[PDB]
Design a protein around this nucleic acid. Structure first.
Length: 544
DNA sequence: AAAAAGACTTAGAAAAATTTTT
DNA sequence: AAAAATTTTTCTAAGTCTTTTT
């Protein structure tokens, strides 16, 4: 049970389509064409992505054109037979014009819309869950557009229809004021289910999946489950040795389904690979996980680049982000891999006889609610602890220590597989300070020089101030030099996500406090708000 | 025991808000 | 001023895990 009471206003529905200006033409074969509304609209979607590689892709265009046709009248259908003959140059230019316009418009325009946004947020961004007014994450309904699937996505480009009240299921308490659908509309169903956390939902027409409107991370419900998310991790931390020495003895099992299991778990532990749930054929870009590694995903090298018993991984993961790695592995694992690989086609799954369900079934058997995913949280978290505990120079300055935090962070966004000429502007700027600082130092030189002979005071104070100047510059300078060393070290690293989902805020908080570092120099309004729990309840001496 | 359905989390892209550079 | 480069924020695709169920 997630609540007893729940009341919201519903979702902001996407705004009505605004027909193009009369002077905004479209053509098919150089022939100006007036498009029916539903068709004009769909064309505008493509028009707004014209300067995006998406529009150059086959699948993208194939999918787009077909669904577009579907929104065509019989006449237009008879006419517009191919996308290549269409010309959105005018439409695209417009929209681009419109954008520059926003980008430059009256500040008067700016404040007025932010207000427009704020009230809207005041009116729809909240719900009342139980005894408190809570905040909604995704309150605005997904606008109709074109499906942008990651990777070589088969259905990329299809049209996402315009969601209607009649597509919307509303969830709330039997005792709540039921949001009134828009004038002239009805909901799909008004349900009261207190076992779920979502307030609204509908089914998406492209992958037939359910989309829900849930609460902001800052919610008691969210943050609660989040506090629990790290706990279990700490709990696994407690039983890891066992588990390790458990799956390792399973490598020797008399049953291959088991050996597969323990080995899968080995990679998930060691490598941080994800569970690897079987995906539905054709709905998305082919990607694989630990459990779904087709033999073609691994290569075994008795000896490689020096190390022995190497397992090379080369496959795409969630979002098609590539995974390449050569891992010297345990002898028993190497040897269990060949066996899992014998008499198999490349396309055959490495751990057939094994599944995500089995895996987690076994895990929760070892520790309550211990799932494949937990391993990643544990590994990440405990790493930030050690790394910080390791990189943080006791006698550094806030700036540098911040660099130390970041450094620690990378080591973490790195295992989790999270993935220019900026240096030209910096270094020049650095040089400025170095020279300013230099010349200022020249000032103190004399300042202190005048001081030897005039031990008065007026003099001594001038030295006092010339010194402050040196200090401020060295300051600015140190900062600069840091940004630099930072930027470089962080070329391909993605820390925003590790920071948002795999790292116990408490560790950070615990750090910031001990090191006298303001959380504000490490989290954004957003992160602080989400991690409000941790912040408030974290001892300087928190140990994960 | 299984699997299809449903629910909740993660994650990069994208947007917008901001700062900084021209 | 404007635009380029950063950062905070928003968006929603892509996954993991649960839950229903026959």
């Amino acid at each position: 049970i997630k609540w007893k009471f729940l009341e919201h206003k519903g979702p902001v529905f996407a705004p009505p389509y605004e027909p193009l200006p009369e002077n905004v033409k479209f053509y098919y074969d150089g022939k100006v064409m007036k498009l029916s509304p539903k068709a004009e609209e769909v064309a505008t979607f493509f028009a707004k992505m014209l300067d995006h590689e998406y529009t150059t892709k086959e699948i993208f265009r194939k999918n787009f054109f077909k669904d577009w046709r579907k929104e065509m009248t019989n006449e237009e259908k008879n006419i517009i037979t191919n996308l290549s003959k269409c010309d959105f140059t005018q439409m695209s230019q417009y929209f681009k014009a419109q954008t520059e316009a926003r980008k430059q418009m009256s500040k008067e325009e700016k404040l007025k819309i932010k207000e427009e946004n704020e009230k809207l947020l005041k009116e729809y961004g909240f719900c009342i869950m139980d005894n408190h007014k809570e905040r909604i994450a995704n309150f605005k309904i997904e606008p109709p557009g074109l499906f942008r699937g990651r990777g070589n996505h088969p259905k990329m480009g299809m049209l996402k229809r315009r969601i209607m009240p009649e597509d919307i299921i509303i969830n709330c308490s039997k005792d709540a004021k039921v949001p009134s659908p828009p004038p002239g509309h009805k909901w799909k169903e008004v349900r009261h289910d207190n076992k779920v956390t979502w307030l609204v939902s509908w089914t998406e027409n492209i992958q037939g999946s359910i989309k829900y409107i849930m609460l902001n991370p800052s919610s008691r419900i969210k943050g609660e489950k989040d506090w629990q998310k790290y706990e279990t991790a700490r709990r696994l931390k407690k039983c890891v040795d066992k588990i390790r020495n458990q799956y390792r003895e399973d490598w020797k099992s008399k049953e291959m389904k088991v050996r597969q299991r323990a080995v899968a778990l080995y990679f998930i532990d060691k490598l941080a690979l994800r569970a690897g749930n079987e995906k539905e054929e054709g709905e998305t870009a082919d990607t694989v996980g630990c459990c779904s590694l087709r033999v073609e995903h691994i290569n075994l090298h008795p000896e490689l680049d020096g190390q022995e018993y190497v397992v090379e991984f080369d496959f795409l993961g969630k979002d098609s982000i590539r995974y390449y790695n050569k891992v010297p592995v345990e002898k028993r694992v190497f040897k269990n891999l060949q066996l899992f690989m014998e008499n198999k086609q490349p396309e055959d799954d490495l751990f057939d006889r094994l599944n995500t369900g089995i895996l987690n079934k076994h895990l929760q058997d070892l520790m309550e609610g211990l799932t494949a995913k937990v391993f990643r949280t544990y590994n990440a978290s405990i790493t930030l602890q050690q790394q910080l505990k390791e990189l943080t120079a006791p006698d550094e300055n806030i700036p540098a220590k911040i660099l130390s935090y970041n450094r620690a962070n990378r080591a973490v966004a790195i295992l989790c597989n999270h993935q220019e000429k900026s240096m030209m502007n910096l270094q020049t700027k650095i040089d400025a300070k170095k020279e300013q600082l230099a010349d200022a130092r020249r000032d103190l030189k004399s300042a202190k020089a005048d001081a030897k002979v005039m031990k008065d005071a007026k003099t001594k104070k001038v030295v006092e101030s010339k010194k402050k100047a040196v200090q401020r510059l060295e300051e600015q300078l140190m900062k600069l030099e840091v940004q630099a060393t930072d930027r470089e070290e962080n070329k391909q690293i993605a820390l925003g996500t590790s920071k948002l989902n795999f790292l116990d805020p408490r560790i950070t908080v615990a750090w910031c406090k001990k090191w006298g570092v303001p959380i504000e120099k490490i989290y954004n309004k957003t992160q602080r708000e989400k991690f409000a729990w941790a912040i408030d309840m974290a001892d300087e001496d928190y140990e994960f």
